[PDB]
Ligand binder design. Structure first.
Ligand SMILES: Nc1nc2c(ncn2[C@H]2C[C@H](O)[C@@H](COP(=O)(O)OP(=O)(O)O)O2)c(=O)[nH]1
Length: 224
C-alpha cells in the first residue's frame, strides 16, 4: 500500500535436481505465488522468462516469482540481474523493492560423479520436462543435453559478480532418498523454514506438515 517487497527465487541447478518438483510443491502450498517455467516457453516467444517475471510482479497481488530455469552457468545468473534491473522501471514504481533469493540445488561438497548418478537416474527412471529431452526417444540425446548443463555448471560464488547480487541464498540437499523421505520434500521443508526465519512477512502462516506432505505428493504424482 506504500512500500511492497517482491521476491524472485532463482535456482542454481542442472537437469533433474528437482526444480520443477520443489517449485510445484511450493505453488500448491502458496497459490498466490507465480511459477514461471522455462520449459513451457517457446524459444521463439516474444515474451521470454525475464519479461514474464516482471509482468507477474506488477499487481499488489503478486509478490513471488519462482524462476524455473537451471542457471547452471554464472552468465545465466548475470542475465537475470541485468535484464530485470534494466526493465523493472517499465513495470514497477519506485516503492517496490525487489529481492533475489538464490535456491542452491547442488551442494558445494557434491562430486560430479554423485551429481550425475542422482540426477541422470532420476531422469531416465522417472522422466523430465526439460524441453529438449521430455520425449526420451534417443536416450543418447538425453545424456548429451544433461552433460551440457553439467559442463557449463559454475557453483554459486557470492564473493564476486554476478552472484554477489543475491540478497539471500538457501542451501538445499541433494541425496539419494533415505528413510523413505524424498530429497525434494526435505528441500521444500528447508525453504519454508528458511523463509519463516529470514523473511517472516512473506509466509503469513506456516503450513501443517501433513499439508506440506500432501502438496508434495501432488507434485510428485504429476505425469504429463
Ligand atoms: N526419487 C526422487 N525423485 C525425484 C525427487 N525430486 C524429483 N524427482 C523426480 C521427479 C522427476 O521425474 C525427476 C526430475 O525432477 P524435476 O523436478 O523434474 O527436476 P528438474 O529437471 O525440474 O530440476 O525426478 C526426489 O527427491 N527423489
Amino acid at each position: 500500500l506504500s512500500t511492497t517487497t517482491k521476491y524472485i527465487f532463482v535456482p542454481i541447478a542442472t537437469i533433474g535436481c528437482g526444480k520443477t518438483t520443489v517449485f510445484n510443491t511450493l505453488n500448491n502450498l502458496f497459490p498466490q505465488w507465480t511459477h514461471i517455467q522455462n520449459n513451457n516457453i517457446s524459444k521463439k516467444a516474444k515474451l521470454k522468462i525475464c519479461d514474464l517475471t516482471l509482468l507477474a510482479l506488477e499487481d499488489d497481488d503478486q509478490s513471488v516469482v519462482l524462476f524455473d530455469r537451471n542457471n547452471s552457468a554464472s552468465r545465466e545468473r548475470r542475465q537475470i540481474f541485468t535484464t530485470i534491473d534494466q526493465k523493472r522501471d517499465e513495470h514497477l514504481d519506485d516503492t517496490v523493492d525487489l529481492k533475489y533469493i538464490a535456491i542452491n540445488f547442488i551442494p558445494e561438497d557434491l562430486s560430479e560423479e554423485e551429481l550425475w548418478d542422482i540426477t541422470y537416474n532420476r531422469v531416465i527412471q522417472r522422466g523430465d520436462n526439460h524441453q529438449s529431452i521430455k520425449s526420451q526417444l534417443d536416450e543418447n540425446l538425453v545424456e548429451s543435453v544433461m552433460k551440457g548443463f553439467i559442463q557449463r555448471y559454475q557453483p554459486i560464488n557470492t564473493s564476486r559478480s554476478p552472484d554477489d547480487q543475491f540478497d539471500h541464498v538457501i542451501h538445499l540437499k541433494l541425496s539419494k532418498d533415505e528413510n523413505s523421505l524424498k530429497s525434494s520434500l526435505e528441500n521444500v521443508r528447508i525453504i519454508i523454514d528458511d523463509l519463516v526465519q529470514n523473511f517472516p512477512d512473506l509466509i503469513k502462516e506456516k503450513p501443517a506438515d501433513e499439508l506440506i506432505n500432501e502438496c508434495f505428493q501432488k507434485a510428485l504424482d504429476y505425469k504429463p
